[PDB]
Write a protein that binds this ligand. Structure first.
Ligand SMILES: C/C(=C\COP(=O)(O)OP(=O)(O)O)CO
Ligand code: F3S
Length: 309
């Protein structure tokens, strides 16, 4: 059994920055540091920090008075941001700058009264954060997940219409949703393609390449990580067995029994240490040295706020 590793995999720039914001806040002010929602969608990063003294809460009510609060990397709504500010809390915002950029366009559409369509997945926090940038009653903010959702949507003024996308969607399914919007709404405006980040794009291409060599694909990531899910899902629609695993303990040996070539990748929120242990576990079930594929270079780094260095 040959182990292949996808390239790129694992940490993106926004995730590295957000985890570092929490560590450096913890280092500058000591436990406890409150954080709204899991800072990133990874069980291991979140138990890692929860035991360094960070406390993960779901509403700003849960956070005391005079306490330090961090917004997660998935971002937050204007309402949340306001409910925090009017409560005398020190606030640090770990929202990935690639989410912020899409927030800015939403809020631009709110101000000018004009309607906006988000392509994203209901109930995901990035979605809640982004829809909640829209507040103008004159217009609207609408959510679509598929072409069918588009075929049913009606809008006040289809002449002044924009769309935005969640960063961590499938590149292919998103393409079909956009195709649907441009055909129902020939005036709609959005980005030359989508708002999907470079990391989601890259991880997708990489796992596509990996799934054409490997029979089985293991994707390191937590259940609630959208991008990680797109990775497994992509592999599966290529007809490969693919499993989303939190770590080595989840590998069932039947999955790799008699498999000539197994592939490993990692969502943008999964730390390299998890992948290393998954590789050691595969080597016990009979695999050789891990071979990384050639891949597209990533050179983007996002620095923590100056106050947190
Ligand atoms: C913060 C962020 C992506 C980082 O990976 P996560 O696994 O935290 O998030 P997602 O794939 O959105 O569930 C933007 O949603
Ligand atoms: S939105 Fe940011 S958090 Fe990573 S998966 Fe994309 S660079």
């Amino acid at each position: 059994m040959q182990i292949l590793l996808a390239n790129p995999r694992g940490f993106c720039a926004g995730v590295d920055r957000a985890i570092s914001i929490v560590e450096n806040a913890l280092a500058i002010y000591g436990a406890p540091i409150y954080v709204r929602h899991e800072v990133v969608h990874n069980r291991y990063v979140v138990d890692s920090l929860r035991e360094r003294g960070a406390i993960f809460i779901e509403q700003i009510s849960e956070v005391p008075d005079g306490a330090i609060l961090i917004f997660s990397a998935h971002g937050v709504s204007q309402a949340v941001r306001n409910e925090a500010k009017s409560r005398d809390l020190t606030v640090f915002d770990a929202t990935c700058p690639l989410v912020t950029k899409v927030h800015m366009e939403v809020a631009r559409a709110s101000r000018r009264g004009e309607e906006s369509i988000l392509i994203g997945h209901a109930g995901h926090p990035e979605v809640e954060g982004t829809m909640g940038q829209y507040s103008n009653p004159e217009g609207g903010m609408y959510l679509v997940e598929s072409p069918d959702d588009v075929w049913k949507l009606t809008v006040k003024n289809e002449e002044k219409l924009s769309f935005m996308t969640q960063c961590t969607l499938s590149v292919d399914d998103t393409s079909d949703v956009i195709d649907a919007l441009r055909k129902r709404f020939p005036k709609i405006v959005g980005p030359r393609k989508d708002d999907i980040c470079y990391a989601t794009t890259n991880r997708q291409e990489a796992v596509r390449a990996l799934a054409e060599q490997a029979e089985v694909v293991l994707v390191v990531g937590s259940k609630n990580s959208s991008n990680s899910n797109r990775l497994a899902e992509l592999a599966q629609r290529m007809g490969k067995r693919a499993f989303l695993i939190d770590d080595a303990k989840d590998i069932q040996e039947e999955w790799v029994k008699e498999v000539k070539c197994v592939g490993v990748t990692a969502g943008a929120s999964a730390p390299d240490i998890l992948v290393q242990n998954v590789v050691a576990r595969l080597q016990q079930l009979g695999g050789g040295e891990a071979i990384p594929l050639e891949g597209r270079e990533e050179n983007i780094v996002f620095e923590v706020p100056k106050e947190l260095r």
